[PDB]
Design an enzyme around this catalytic site. Sequence first.
Site, short mmCIF file in Angstrom:
data_model
loop_
_atom_site.label_atom_id
_atom_site.label_comp_id
_atom_site.label_asym_id
_atom_site.label_seq_id
_atom_site.Cartn_x
_atom_site.Cartn_y
_atom_site.Cartn_z
N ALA A 10 -7.27 -3.07 5.96
CA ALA A 10 -8.26 -2.85 4.90
C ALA A 10 -9.64 -2.59 5.49
O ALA A 10 -10.22 -1.52 5.30
CB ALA A 10 -8.29 -4.06 3.96
N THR A 43 0.83 -1.20 0.00
CA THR A 43 0.00 0.00 0.00
C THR A 43 0.86 1.25 0.00
O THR A 43 1.79 1.37 0.79
CB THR A 43 -0.94 0.04 1.22
OG1 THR A 43 -1.71 -1.16 1.27
CG2 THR A 43 -1.88 1.23 1.11
C1 LIG Z 1 -5.87 -1.90 1.02
C2 LIG Z 1 -5.54 -1.63 2.50
C3 LIG Z 1 -4.54 -2.36 3.02
N1 LIG Z 1 -3.92 -3.29 2.06
C4 LIG Z 1 -3.35 -4.60 2.47
O1 LIG Z 1 -2.86 -5.29 1.63
C5 LIG Z 1 -3.34 -5.11 3.90
N2 LIG Z 1 -4.11 -6.36 3.87
C6 LIG Z 1 -5.32 -6.56 4.69
O2 LIG Z 1 -5.71 -5.70 5.42
C7 LIG Z 1 -6.08 -7.91 4.61
C8 LIG Z 1 -7.19 -7.82 3.57
C9 LIG Z 1 -7.36 -9.02 2.60
N3 LIG Z 1 -8.47 -9.06 1.65
O3 LIG Z 1 -6.57 -9.91 2.63
N4 LIG Z 1 -6.63 -8.25 5.92
C10 LIG Z 1 -6.35 -9.60 6.46
O4 LIG Z 1 -5.69 -10.35 5.82
C11 LIG Z 1 -6.88 -10.05 7.84
N5 LIG Z 1 -5.73 -10.56 8.58
C12 LIG Z 1 -5.62 -11.95 9.06
O5 LIG Z 1 -4.65 -12.29 9.65
C13 LIG Z 1 -6.74 -12.99 8.80
O6 LIG Z 1 -7.08 -13.25 7.69
C14 LIG Z 1 -7.42 -13.67 10.00
C15 LIG Z 1 -7.63 -15.16 9.68
C16 LIG Z 1 -8.77 -13.01 10.28
C17 LIG Z 1 -8.62 -11.56 10.79
C18 LIG Z 1 -7.48 -8.87 8.60
C19 LIG Z 1 -6.40 -8.13 9.45
C20 LIG Z 1 -6.32 -8.34 10.83
C21 LIG Z 1 -5.34 -7.68 11.58
C22 LIG Z 1 -4.44 -6.81 10.95
O7 LIG Z 1 -3.46 -6.16 11.73
C23 LIG Z 1 -4.51 -6.62 9.57
C24 LIG Z 1 -5.50 -7.27 8.82
C25 LIG Z 1 -3.54 -5.66 8.82
C26 LIG Z 1 -3.27 -4.39 9.33
C27 LIG Z 1 -2.38 -3.54 8.66
C28 LIG Z 1 -1.77 -3.96 7.46
C29 LIG Z 1 -2.05 -5.25 6.94
C30 LIG Z 1 -2.91 -6.10 7.62
N6 LIG Z 1 -2.96 -7.18 6.89
C31 LIG Z 1 -2.33 -7.46 5.78
O8 LIG Z 1 -2.35 -8.44 5.11
C32 LIG Z 1 -1.55 -6.10 5.60
O9 LIG Z 1 -0.31 -6.31 5.68
C33 LIG Z 1 -1.86 -5.35 4.26
O10 LIG Z 1 -1.22 -4.12 4.29
#
Ligand SMILES: C/C=C\NC(=O)[C@H]1NC(=O)[C@H](CC(N)=O)NC(=O)[C@@H](NC(=O)C(=O)[C@H](C)CC)Cc2ccc(O)c(c2)-c2cccc3c2NC(=O)[C@@]3(O)[C@@H]1O
Lengths: 243, 249, 212, 239, 232, 222, 233, 246
Positions: free
Chosen positions: C49, C1
Amino acid sequence: GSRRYDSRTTIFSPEGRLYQVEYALESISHAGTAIGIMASDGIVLAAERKVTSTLLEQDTSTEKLYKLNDKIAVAVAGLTADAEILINTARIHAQNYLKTYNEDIPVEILVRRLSDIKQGYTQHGGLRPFGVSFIYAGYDDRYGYQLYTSNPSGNYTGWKAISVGANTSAAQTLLQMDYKDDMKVDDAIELALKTLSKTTDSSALTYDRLEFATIRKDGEVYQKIFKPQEIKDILVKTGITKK
Amino acid sequence: TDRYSFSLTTFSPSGKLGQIDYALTAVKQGVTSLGIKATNGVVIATEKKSSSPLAMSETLSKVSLLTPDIGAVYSGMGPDYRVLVDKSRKVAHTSYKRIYGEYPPTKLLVSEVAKIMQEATQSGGVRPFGVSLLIAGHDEFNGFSLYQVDPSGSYFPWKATAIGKGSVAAKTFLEKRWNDELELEDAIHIALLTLKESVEGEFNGDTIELAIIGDENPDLLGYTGIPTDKGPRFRKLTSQEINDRLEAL
Amino acid sequence: TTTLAFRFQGGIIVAVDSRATAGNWVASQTVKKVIEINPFLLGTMAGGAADCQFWETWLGSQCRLHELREKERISVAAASKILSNLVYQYKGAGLSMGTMICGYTRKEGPTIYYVDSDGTRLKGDIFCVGSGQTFAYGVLDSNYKWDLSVEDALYLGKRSILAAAHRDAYSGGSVNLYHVTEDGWIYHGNHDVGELFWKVKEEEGSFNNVIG
Amino acid sequence: EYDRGVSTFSPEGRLFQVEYSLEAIKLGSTAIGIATKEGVVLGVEKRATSPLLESDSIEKIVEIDRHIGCAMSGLTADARSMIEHARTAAVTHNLYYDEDINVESLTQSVCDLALRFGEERLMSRPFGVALLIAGHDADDGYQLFHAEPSGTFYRYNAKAIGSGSEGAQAELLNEWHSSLTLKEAELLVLKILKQVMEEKLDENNAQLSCITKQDGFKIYDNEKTAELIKELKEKEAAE
Amino acid sequence: RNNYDGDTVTFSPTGRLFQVEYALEAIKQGSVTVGLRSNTHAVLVALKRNADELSSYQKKIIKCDEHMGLSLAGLAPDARVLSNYLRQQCNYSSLVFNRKLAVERAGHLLCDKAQKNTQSYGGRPYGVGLLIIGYDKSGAHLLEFQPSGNVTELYGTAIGARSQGAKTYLERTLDTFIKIDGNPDELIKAGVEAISQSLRDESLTVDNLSIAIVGKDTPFTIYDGEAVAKYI
Amino acid sequence: QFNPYGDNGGTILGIAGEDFAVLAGDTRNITDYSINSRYEPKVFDCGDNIVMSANGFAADGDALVKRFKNSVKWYHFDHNDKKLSINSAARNIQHLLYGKRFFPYYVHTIIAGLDEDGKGAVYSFDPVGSYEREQCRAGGAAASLIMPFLDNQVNFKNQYEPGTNGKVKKPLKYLSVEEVIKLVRDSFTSATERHIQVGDGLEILIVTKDGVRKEFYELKRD
Amino acid sequence: TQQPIVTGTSVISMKYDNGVIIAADNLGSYGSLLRFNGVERLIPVGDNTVVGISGDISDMQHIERLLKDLVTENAYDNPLADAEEALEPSYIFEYLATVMYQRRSKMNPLWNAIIVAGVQSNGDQFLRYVNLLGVTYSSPTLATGFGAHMANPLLRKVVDRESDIPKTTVQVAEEAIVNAMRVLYYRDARSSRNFSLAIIDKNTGLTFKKNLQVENMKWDFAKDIKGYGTQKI
Amino acid sequence: GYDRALSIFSPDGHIFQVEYALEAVKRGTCAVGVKGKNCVVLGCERRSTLKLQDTRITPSKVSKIDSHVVLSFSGLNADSRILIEKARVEAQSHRLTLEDPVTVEYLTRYVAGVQQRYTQSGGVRPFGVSTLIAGFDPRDDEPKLYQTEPSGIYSSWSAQTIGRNSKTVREFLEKNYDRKEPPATVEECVKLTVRSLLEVVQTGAKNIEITVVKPDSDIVALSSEEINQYVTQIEQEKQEQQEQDK
Ligand SMILES: C/C=C\NC(=O)[C@H]1NC(=O)[C@H](CC(N)=O)NC(=O)[C@@H](NC(=O)C(=O)[C@H](C)CC)Cc2ccc(O)c(c2)-c2cccc3c2NC(=O)[C@@]3(O)[C@@H]1O
Ligand SMILES: [Mg+2]
C-alpha cells in the site's frame, strides 16, 4: 595563503592560447629530432640522441623509441621521464583493451586516450602539462599501417610522413619534397636518414647518435628495433657515411 | 590543510623547467661522486666531506645498499638522498619482490626511482629532488649495469661517469682511461685516481667511500644450506682495503 | 487487491477494487487504487500500500519535472520506465509492488505497461494484477473483444472486478472505473460491491451460486 | 583583481564579484514585470544578434511551475541551473506537502544559492543573471519579485532589469497605479520595451507572458503579441 | 591597508584584521535598528529600507524561537544564515534537553561561529550585525553581536546608520526605560523615539517600521504595517 | 537477539463530524502483563488545530510525534507562518513514516482536524505511511473491536430503512458532537471490558474551528 | 551492548507531598553469582536530581560519566549554573532519553532501565522512566524489573492516583519503600539486603542514606515447614 | 584538490577566461551550417598548411553524436573530443532511459550546460570550442541547426558560421539566404555551403569538407571529387557572370 604561489597552468591568454602548452612546445622544439615515415609495406621511425658521450652505453639505451605493444611503437621528443610515465599508462591501457575485447587495441584508440590524458592535464588540476611529443607508428587490421602524432596540447593528427622535435620545419619541407605515395620501406629508410643528416645540428650523422625502428610485414608484423651495428650498417649502406 | 595542490615546477616562456635546472645546479655544487663499470663488476666511489672533525663520519654513509645486488651513490643534498634510498628499498620490495619472489633487475629499480623523482617535478606542493644518483646493479639476464638518474626523472646507462663538482674533469679522465676490457681491480684503481684528482685534502680509507658490485660473497649471507642462494654482490670496502689499494697508487 | 486494464477501439478501460487488508483483517474498503499521475496518465497499484502510493506519487512528480524540462507530455513508455528503473534500484530491498501505467499519447496511442518490484516491465493489451487477477483474467479473456463499445468495455471491466471481488476474499469494497481516451482519463464512478453484486445478479441471470 | 579572494570584502563593505556580476547584468537584455490585481505580466527583449538567428529559440521567459513564471536578464547561461533548482523546489514542496509552494518561498530558495560561491562544494563565481519571478498564491495574491546574485530579493509592483533599467523604472514609477488591469500592463510593458529597444519592437524581438489565477503562467504566442503591438500602435498614434 | 586587506588570515603590522573592519563598514552602511529591554520586556525597533517606491521594504526582524528573536543590520544573506543557525541551536536545546536556550549561550554560539570564519583562509567573515532580544529563566536579555565575534549584553543599544543618536538617547533614558516593567506600549514608544533620534530627512511610516516584542507573558511577536500605526 | 521493538498496548479512535473532529485515546501504558502507568497520554495537540496520535510502540510513537511537531515549527519558520493544512500534514507524515520504510515506526498513526473548507477530517497511516482520509478510524490493540462498531453506528452499515424490503439504506447523516462523545465512551468501555490492554482512563481531544479542548473520563482498572 | 554481563536488579521510587523518594540495592550480579557487593546504583546529580539505574553495570558507569560531563559542560560560561540555569531533573531525563532511543535505533543500546526523580525549580515533583528501548512513561510510582511486578502493587496502594500525592507524608513513603525493599529481598534471587535510599524534598533538599539494611524479617514460621507434603518429621 | 576560481568577474562585468576561450574559437578553422527544406549541410575548412597529412586516419571536423545528429566545432580539437564524447554518452543514456533518441535541441542544451558548468566551476577553464549541432528530430522531417558558445549560450540558426573569418561567411549567408525560399534540394544547399566556404577557403576543394544530414538518420560525407565538381561548377558560373557583363 597559497594563492600567491599558484602559476595557474590551465588558463587562457588574451589571444586564446595556453601558456604552458606553448612553453612545453618550445621546450620540445629544443629537444632531439624524430621522424616517422609511413610506406605502402611498412613504417619507419628514426631519432637523434641529444645525450651524446663516448662513455654512454648505447646498447641498453632507449631514450627516443619505445614499444607500446607488439603492433605499436612511439618516438619521443621532450622530457624523457614524462614520456615514460605516459608510455607506461599507454601500455596498461592497451593490455586492458586486450583483456576486455580479446583483440589487439586499434592504434587510434590508444592515441586518443593519451591525447585526452594530455588535454585533461591542460584544463584542470592546476598541474604542469606533459612536456612530450609522440610519434605513434602502428598496424591494425582496420586501417593498415598508421602514423599519428600528439603534442602537449592534447591534440593528435595523422600523417604520411611527419617530424617532431627540433628543426621540424626544414624536415617537413624536405619530406614533402622527396615523399612519394608509392614508396617502399627501404625508400622510407633512405628518406628518413637523409632528412636527419641534412637537418642535424651536429657535425655529421653517426650511429652513436641514432635510434632506428621498422614495423614491417606473412600475416604477422615484425617490430625491429635497430641495434648499434645495424644502425651503422644502414648508415654506411644509404651513403650517409662510409667505412 | 595542504592547499598547495598546484604544480610548483612549470614551464618558463624560454621552454625551461626552472626548478629542475635549479636542482641540477644544487647537484653541481655537491661533492664529487663517480661510477665505473668493468667486465666483472662495477665500482662506485665518493668523498666523505664531514661537517666537523668531532662528528663520526662512519655513522653517516653516502654509499647505500638498495638490494643485495644493487647499490647507490649520490651527489647533492644528503637528506633527499636518504629519503630516496628509503623509498627505493621499499619500492623494490613491494613493486617486485613481493610479486615475483626475486629482487628487481637494475633497470627496473632505476625506472621506479626515476618515476618517484619525476613525480616531484610535476606533483603539487613539492620541489624536485636536489640529488643526482649513480646506481650500480647486477641481474642474471642483463649482467652488470651502471645508471645515472637526474632530478628531471631521466636516467642514462653509463659505461663510466661522474657527477658533482669535478664532474667535467672526472668524465674527461674516465674517457681517456676507460676501456671495454677492464677488470674490477683496474676499475677500482681508475676510480681512486680520479678521486685523488678531484680531492684537495686528505685522501685515505677514512675520508673516501667506495663500494663494488662484483662477485657473490656467500660469507656475507648469514646462513648456509641453500645452494641456489648465494651471497650478495654489493659490498662496501673497509678502510683497511682502501688504504691497501691506495698504498699502490 | 484486484486491478485490470485493457485497451480497445475506444481507448483504454481501467478498473480496480478498494479493499486493503492486513492479513485476515480488512484494514479499509475506501482505498483509491488508481493514482491520477496527470490528466493523461493513470497508475493502478497492487501489493504494498505505502510502497505503491508513495512511488506512484513520486512518479507523478517526476513526470511533472519532465514536462517542465522538455515542454512536452511524458510518454507512457518513459513514465513506466522511470518507475521501473527506480524499483530495480530498490530490487531485493523488500519492496512489493505490482502496478499498471496506462496512458494515451499522440506518439504512442493507447499504451499499457505492467511494472513490478522484480523489475519486470511489459507493454501489453490486457493486464490483471493482484490477488484476484485470475478471476478477472478469466472473465475478461472469455468476454473480451477489440470491437467493444465504450459502454460494453466499461461494463466488462466492472464485471471482471466484480467476479474477482466475489471469489477472492482479499478483494472487495467498491469498484473504481476509468476510461482513457485522446483527451485523457474520465472517472466513471465508485460502485459499491455490496449493491453492484445484487444488481448484476438480477440483471444478468448469473451468480446463481448465491442464495437470493 | 586575481590578487585577492573571490569572497573578499572591499573597504566600502561589499563583495567584489557581486558588484561585478551586477555590472554584467547591467550589460544584459531588458526584462520588465508589472503586477496587478488581475495578474502579473513579464516582457523580455529577445535581442537576436543576426537576421539568420531564429528568434523562436530565445527563451528568456521560463515556467517554474503552473503558478510561477520567471524572466532572466544578463548571462542567460547561468540562469539554467537556477531555473532547474526552482522547478525542482516547487515539485518537491508539492510532493512533500500536496500544495503549491509560495512565490516568496520559491524566491528565497533561489536566492539561497546566490552566495554559495567561493573556494560543502561552492561554485567559483556568483551568478551573472538577474531574475524576475512572478506568481500567485492564496496568501499574498499576485506577487512579483526581483532576485539578484547578491542573495537579496525584493518585491516590486513593477520592476525593470537590464539595459535601460533606470529610465524604464522611472516610467513605471510614473505610469503605475493599484487599479491597473492586465491589458493595460501588457501595453505598458510593450511601450517601455519599444522605447528602450534599439530595434523597432515587433512580435519577433520581444516576448510577452502573464500569470493569472485561472490559466496559470502562459507565454504569449507571436500572433497575440503582434495584435497587442497593433493595439499599442493605435493607442500611441491617437494620443 | 593595501597588502594586508586581501584575506581574513593576514594580520596588519598594527595588529588589525582588515576584512573584519570591512564587514563592520558593510554594517554601518545599513538601515538603523535599536533594541531596549527592561526587566519584564524586550523591544526591537527596526527601520526597513526600500529600493524605490515600487519596491517592498526588506525584512529586518527574524524569529528564532518563541522566546528569542533578533534584528539585522547589513548583509541579508549572512543574517539569514546566522538566524537559521540560531533557530537550529534553540531547536536542538528544546528537543534534546527540553530546555529553552539561554540568550547568553546563543551569543556565545554566534561569537564562535563568526570567529570560525575570521581565522581560516578561504571564505569571508560575516557581514551583518545583530540585536538579539530574549526572555529566559533569568529574565529579559538584549545582546549586540558584531561579526568580529564580539557579543555584549546591554540594557539598550542600536546599530546601523546614524546609530549614535539612538545610542545616546538610550544612554540618557536608561534610568527611565529600565523601570518600564509590565507596560509593553511604553517600551515600544521609547524604542520608537530612540529610532527617531536617528532620522535625517525621513519620516516613520507603517511601511518602513517593524517592531518586535518578547517578554514574560508575551512570546516573541513581530508587528508590521497597520499594527505599528498605533506608535507613529 | 536484542529486539528493538515493543508493544505498549493502548487504543486510539478518531471521528470527524460536520464542523468538528475528535481524537480519543486510552491513557493506559502497559508492557507484557504489567502496567507501566495509568495516565500516559498519546493524543497530542501539535498546533494549527491538528491533533495527532501514533499508537503502538511508545518510543516510536513519541519519536514520530516529536518529529512532526518539529516539522510544523520549521514549516512556520520557512513559509511566513503559513497555517499547515491537514492534507499537507498528512502528506508530510506519510513521508516521515516512509523515511524508515525499512525500519518502520511500529505505530498506527491517526491525525484529526479541520480541512480548508472548515469541515471535520481524519487521516489514518499504517506504520510505513499509506495514508487515507476517512470519517472514522480506530487503531491499536482494540482497533479490531471498535472499527466494526464504528462502521455500524457512524456510516450506518448493514442498516436499512425499516419496511423498505432491504432496498433503501439508512440515510447517511452527520453526527452531533454529543453523539460522537457518547459513541467514543461506549467504544472505550467495551474495549476495557473485553481487552486487557485498555482501561484506566479515556482522554478525548475535540478540535473545532475555535480550537482544541480536552475531556477526561475514568475507565475500569481491571 | 548486545547482552548484559554484570547487572543490578530492581529500582523503586514514588512521589509524596513535598518531594520524591528512590531506592535500590548495592548488588552487582555476574549472572547467578552475587559477585560485587556495595555497588551504588543511585547517582545524585546536583542537589535536586537522582538517577536510579538497573542493568549492565558497565553501561551504568558510562551513564555516570555522561552525567558528570553534562554537569561540567553546563557549568561552562554559566554564571547562574548554581541558580536559575542549573540542571533540572527534566533536562537530565530528556537528555538520557534521547541517548537511550538513539542507542536503540543504532542497534547498540544501553542495556539499562533508568528512573529520574527530583524536584524542579518551582517545587514540582518529577519522576519518570526510560529503558534500553527508549520507552518513556511517568507514574506516581515507578519500578524496574521485579520491582515493577512487586514493588508497584504495594506502593500503588498508597498513591493510586495523583490526588493521593498531597496526602502522603515523608514517613509514609519511606516506610513503604523500606517494606518494598524487604519484600524484594524475600522474593528476588538477584537481590541484596544492603541498599541505598534517596529523598528529594522541595524543602530539605537531598537526603542520601547509604549502607541501609532490610530489618524486621519474619522467618520463625520456617521451623513449622517439614517435608513437601506427606512427610511428618 | 585544486579548486582555484579561474573564471571570475572583472570590474566591468566580464568573465575574462570565457572571452579568451571565444578568442581561441576565433583562431580555429572555419565551420558553417545551412538549413534546406529537407536537409542540413555542414561545411568545414581544412588547414592547407599541412600537406603530408593522410585523410584516412585524421579525425574529421564533423562527428556523429548519434545516427541522426552530427556536431562540428571550431577551436581546440582536444576540448572538442571531450565534448563529443560526453554528448555521445548522454545520447546513449537518453536512448536507454527514454527508449527514444534525443532531439537536436536536447543534445545542444546538454552540451551548452556542460560548457556553462566549465565556466562556473573551480580548478577548470572553459572550453575553447564553439559548436554547431545539426540533425533531425526522431520521426520528424523539420531540419534542426543549433550553435553553442564557450559561455554556455545556445541558439537555433537557419544558417551560421563559426571560427576564423566567420564574419565574411556570415555576411555571405545573410546576403544569399532567403528565409522564404530555403534551398529546396540538397544540391542547392551544398552549393551554397561550398560558395560560403570558397569566400574564405582560398586554396581549393581539398581544404573543404562537406557533410549532408537527411531525415531518418541519413548522414553522408561528400567525397573530395564531388566537392571538386561543385567548386568547378561554381567557378564556371562565376566566369559566365564575368562574360555576361561583356
Ligand atoms: C491497497 C494496496 C494493497 N492492499 C493490501 O491490502 C495490502 N496491505 C498493506 O499493504 C498493509 C496496509 C494496511 N493499512 O494494513 N501494509 C501493512 O500491513 C504493513 N505490514 C506489516 O507487516 C506491519 O504492519 C509492520 C508492523 C510494519 C511494517 C506494511 C507492509 C510491509 C511489508 C510488506 O511486504 C507489505 C506491507 C505488503 C506488500 C504486498 C502486499 C501486502 C502487504 N501487506 C499486506 O497486508 C498485503 O498483503 C496487502 O495486499
Ligand atoms: Mg481492561
